[PDB]
DNA sequence: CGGGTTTTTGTTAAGGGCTGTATCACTGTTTAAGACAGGCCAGATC
């Protein structure tokens, strides 16, 4: 009700329980059950509001699976030479 | 001192997806250096 870096994972779950009601509501039923891209892209806008698309960038690379992240074959590639 | 409230928290059990750590089967394929005690030959000696 306060703050969120202090509120725990299921404080802020009481504290947006109706922001999750509703996002999901609306996304499986326009997305065709789906809620991942959907909040995905609503963190991107509700981010990029502040012009970070150096962040945005950085989260659509993680998603994208380039980036800090070292898919399964590239360290395979290492442990094996 | 309370006392309605917040503000956050504690709890249940099934099943799964994930992760971290323990466990498992398994591989080496006789020493060498030095101390001491017999025992038996082997020579020095009466």
Same mark, same amino acid.
């Given at each position: &009700?306060? +703050? ?5 994972? /299921?404080?802020? @779950? +009481?504290?947006? &329980? %109706?922001? @999750?009601?509703?996002?999901? %509501?609306? #996304?499986? @039923? ?5 809620? @991942? !891209? ?7 806008? !509700?981010? /990029?509001? &502040?012009?970070? +698309? /150096?962040?945005?960038? %950085?989260?659509? #690379? =993680?998603?994208?699976? &380039? ?5 399964? #074959?590239?360290?395979?590639? =290492?442990?094996?030479?």
């Amino acid at each position: &009700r306060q +703050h969120l870096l202090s509120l725990t994972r /299921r404080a802020q @779950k +009481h504290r947006l &329980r %109706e922001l @999750k009601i509703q996002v999901k %509501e609306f #996304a499986d @039923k326009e997305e065709g059950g789906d809620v @991942k !891209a959907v909040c995905l892209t609503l963190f991107l806008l !509700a981010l /990029r509001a &502040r012009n970070e +698309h /150096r962040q945005a960038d %950085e989260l659509e #690379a =993680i998603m994208q699976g &380039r980036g800090s992240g070292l898919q399964p #074959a590239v360290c395979l590639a =290492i442990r094996v030479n």
